[PDB]
Ligand SMILES: Cc1c(S(=O)(=O)N2CCc3[nH]ncc3C2)cc(C(=O)NCc2c(F)ccc3occc23)n1C
Ligand SMILES: Nc1ncnc2c1ncn2[C@@H]1O[C@H](CSCC[C@H](N)C(=O)O)[C@@H](O)[C@H]1O
Ligand SMILES: [Zn+2]
C-alpha cells in the first residue's frame with residue numbers, strides 16, 4: 001500500500017507524522033522507494049540554500065525575500081512544473097536530500113488536502129488558485145499560484161553515510177557543484193536515478209503510454225528482423241551471440257543458425273537458456289570470435305568487430321527520454337532503461353549500417369531504387385507487393401531514426417552478397 005506516517009525518519013539530516021506538523025500542516029506526502037520508481041516521470045529534484053534561494057533539477061533558480069515576491073515566486077513554480085510535467089505525469093515527486101530548510105519552505109508554495117479533480121477535466125488536481133478557490137491539473141493551471149498534493153522522498157532515508165556531494169560523485173562525473181540550490185537538486189535526482197535504475201532493468205514495472213511508444217517499438221522490431229535476417233543470408237554465420245537478451249526470444253525464429261543468449265540479468269523463467277555474462281571489451285575482446293554478436297540496445301563500453309548493434313542516442317529530446325546519471329539518460333518506454341552516454345569511441349571497430357529493403361518472398365508510380373533488393377528489381381521493374389512493403393519499411397526505418405536509434409555493423413557487411421541470394 002502506502003508509507004505509514006508511523007515510520008521513523010532518520011534525523012541526521014521522530015516519524016513522518018511529526019515531520020509534517022513541523023513543516024506547517026493521500027495518507028502521507030512521503031512515498032516509498034517502490035512508489036517513487038513507478039512515478040519516475042514525476043521526479044523534480046528540490047533543494048534550498050532571510051531571503052531563500054529555491055532550486056530545481058530543471059536548472060531553474062528563484063530567490064524570494066521577506067530577490068522576488070513570494071506571490072510571484074509561487075506563480076513561476078506552478079508554471080515551470082506545469083510546463084515540465086503536463087505530458088509526463090499526473091503528479092510531481094520532489095526528490096530531496098533533506099537538510100530541514102527545504103521542508104520548511106514548502107508551506108509558502110504547497111497546499112495539501114484530500115485527492116481532488118481539475119475544474120476543467122477528469123485529471124487529478126496538481127494546482128490550486130487562492131484567487132478563485134479552484135483546482136487544476138498541469139494542463140489547466142494557467143493562473144494558478146499553489147502546488148496541490150505534491151509527493152516527495154528523502155534520498156538520505158535510503159541509508160547514505162557522507163554528504164550529497166561525496167555520494168553523487170561516486171557514480172557521476174558530469175554534475176559539478178557550482179555552489180547553488182539547482183546543482184544540489186540536479187545531483188540529488190541523479191543519485192536517486194543511480195540507486196533506482198542503473199544496476200538492472202525491473203521487468204515487472206511497466207509505464208503508461210504517453211507518446212508514440214507502440215509505433216516506435218513496432219518499427220524497431222521490423223528493422224531488427226530485416227537487418228539480422230539480411231546479415232545471416234549475406235555472411236552465412238554458423239553462430240549468433242545475442243548479448244543482452246534476458247527472455248531468450250530470437251528476432252528471426254526461422255534462421256538456420258545456432259542462436260546463443262547472454263545477459264547480465266537473465267529472467268528466472270528462461271535462465272536455463274541464457275548465460276549470465278557482463279560484457280566489457282577489456283574482459284571479452286578475445287571472446288565470441290566465431291559467427292556474429294547481436295547487441296540490440298546492449299550498451300557496452302566498446303563493441304567487437306563482428307557485431308550488429310542498435311544504440312539509442314541519449315542526447316535525443318523526447319517525453320520518453322529523461323535526464324540520467326553520468327551523461328546517460330533514463331529512456332522510459334514500456335519499462336525504464338538507464339542508457340549510458342552516447343560515445344562514438346564505442347563504434348570504432350564498426351561502420352554505420354546503410355539503408356536497404358531485402359525480400360526473398362514471392363513477387364505480386366514506378367520505383368527506381370538501388371536499395372530495393374528484390375527478385376523483380378534485379379529484372380528491370382519492381383512488383384506492386386515489394387514496392388508497397390518497401391515504402392512501409394522506409395516509413396519504419398525513418399520512425400526508428402527520428403526516435404533516436406542508430407544502426408552499426410561489422411566493416412565487411414555489403415548488400416552485394418544479398419544480390420547473390422536470388
Ligand atoms: C523500448 C524497448 C526496448 S529497446 O528499444 O531495445 N531499449 C530501449 C533503449 C535502451 N537503452 N538501454 C536499454 C534499452 C532497451 C526493449 C524493450 C523490451 O521490452 N524488450 C523485452 C524483450 C527482450 F528483452 C528480448 C526479446 C524481446 O522480444 C520482444 C520483446 C523483447 N522495450 C520495451
Ligand atoms: N554489459 C552488459 N553485458 C550484458 N548484458 C548487458 C550489459 N548491459 C546491459 N545488459 C543487458 O541488456 C539488456 C538491455 S534491455 C533488453 C534489450 C534486448 N536486446 C531487446 O531486444 O529487447 C538488459 O537485459 C541488461 O541486463
Ligand atoms: Zn485539467
Ligand SMILES: [Zn+2]
Nearest residue numbers: 172175190326
Ligand atoms: Zn550527476
Ligand SMILES: [Zn+2]
Nearest residue numbers: 363376383386
Ligand atoms: Zn517483387
